[PDB]
Design an enzyme around this catalytic site. Structure first.
Site, PDB file in Angstrom:
ATOM      1  CG  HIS A  40      -0.461   0.183   2.505  1.00 18.74           C
ATOM      2  ND1 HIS A  40      -0.107  -0.874   3.317  1.00 18.74           N
ATOM      3  CD2 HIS A  40      -0.214   1.306   3.220  1.00 18.74           C
ATOM      4  CE1 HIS A  40       0.331  -0.409   4.474  1.00 18.74           C
ATOM      5  NE2 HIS A  40       0.274   0.911   4.440  1.00 18.74           N
ATOM      6  CG  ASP A  84       0.349  -4.231   2.913  1.00 16.82           C
ATOM      7  OD1 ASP A  84       0.708  -3.680   1.854  1.00 16.82           O
ATOM      8  OD2 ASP A  84       0.065  -3.586   3.942  1.00 16.82           O
ATOM      9  N   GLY A 175       2.325   6.759   9.025  1.00 20.24           N
ATOM     10  CA  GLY A 175       3.658   7.231   8.700  1.00 20.24           C
ATOM     11  C   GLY A 175       4.693   6.144   8.943  1.00 20.24           C
ATOM     12  CB  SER A 177       2.611   2.074   6.248  1.00 16.30           C
ATOM     13  OG  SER A 177       1.388   1.610   6.780  1.00 16.30           O
ATOM     14  N   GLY A 178       5.160   0.123   6.057  1.00 21.42           N
ATOM     15  CA  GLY A 178       6.283  -0.303   5.244  1.00 21.42           C
ATOM     16  C   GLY A 178       7.552  -0.510   6.043  1.00 21.42           C
TER      17      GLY A 178
END
Ligand SMILES: [Ca+2]
Ligand SMILES: [Ca+2]
Ligand code: NA
Lengths: 223, 58
Positions: A40, A84, A175, A177-178
């Site tokens: 995402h 994801d 902020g 994420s990933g």
């Protein structure tokens, strides 16, 4: 990161920032040319920022490298959030030293209760908004699949795992994420989603990296 | 039918910090907000121009 602490400059050398004119996601450097992040987090014109601490100021150890490729998992589902994960290739190889280093992929999945390090430049407030200048860190344990499913009925797939504290107050947030969830020196998770941030009975949900090791290795090698 | 331009901005469950635009009916203008990365509702635009074209005057 809500309820965490200031990591310290470059103490998490594999943590990178994905920038598209501003910081929008985190990522983990797995080798000099590749970064693991969330599906995402796919965005146009991504620039990977390595060696960062204060995300708003040039401190001298930064390496800004554009993404040359962004491979979202072929089975990523934007509705269920299953699979994801995304791999980003750096246009030029990053200079690895102490301040910019890769994180090892797991050889096996981590068990419930295992303490891990979660980091990022995301929101530090459960209610409200406050984004840090420097990198934030949080020590949180892997939670059982049963507790994860109970917290999020009909939403947890075999490629997701929960981590955090059920009483609330400590979690990853917008902020982050990933970004990485590292346990015993291995990248076990990718910050993915959750119901709000640091809410009671709603721990953070993360992509289960241990299920994608073969895919990661082969994909990297074929690009 | 309900005007999607009048729905409050939706961040979603994902944890990215992506800046998007939404039409703020009370203020009568397209404003910025934080989108999490997935499960976007329709009052979510990539630019002020897209927002005004779709929701201007709502
Ligand atoms: Ca900096
Ligand atoms: Ca605004
Ligand atoms: Na600093």
């Amino acid at each position: 990161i809500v309820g965490g602490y200031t990591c310290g400059a470059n103490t998490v050398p594999y943590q990178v920032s994905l920038n598209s004119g501003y910081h929008f996601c985190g990522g983990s450097l797995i080798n000099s040319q590749w970064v693991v992040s969330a599906a995402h987090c796919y965005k146009s014109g991504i620039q990977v920022r390595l060696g960062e601490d204060n995300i708003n100021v040039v401190e001298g150890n930064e390496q800004f490298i554009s993404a040359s490729k962004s491979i979202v998992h072929p089975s990523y589902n934007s509705n269920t959030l299953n699979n994801d994960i995304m791999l980003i290739k750096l246009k030029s190889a990053a200079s690895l030293x102490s301040r910019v280093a890769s994180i090892s992929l797991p050889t096996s999945c981590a068990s419930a209760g295992t303490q891990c390090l979660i980091s990022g430049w995301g929101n530090t407030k459960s209610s409200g908004t406050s984004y840090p200048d420097v990198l934030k860190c949080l020590k949180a344990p892997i939670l059982s699949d049963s507790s994860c499913k109970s917290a999020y009925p009909g939403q947890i797939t075999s490629n997701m795992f929960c981590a955090g504290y059920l009483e609330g107050g400590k979690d990853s947030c917008q902020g982050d994420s990933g970004g990485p969830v590292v346990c015993s020196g291995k990248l076990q998770g990718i910050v993915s989603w959750g119901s709000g941030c640091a809410q009671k009975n709603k721990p953070g949900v993360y992509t289960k990296v241990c299920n994608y090791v073969s895919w990661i290795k082969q994909t990297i090698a074929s690009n | 039918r309900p005007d999607f331009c009048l729905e409050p901005p939706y961040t979603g469950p994902c944890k990215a910090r992506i800046i998007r635009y939404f039409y703020n009916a009370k203020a009568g203008l397209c404003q910025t907000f934080v989108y999490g990365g997935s499960r976007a509702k329709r009052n979510n635009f990539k630019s002020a121009e897209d927002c005004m074209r779709t929701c201007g005057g709502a």
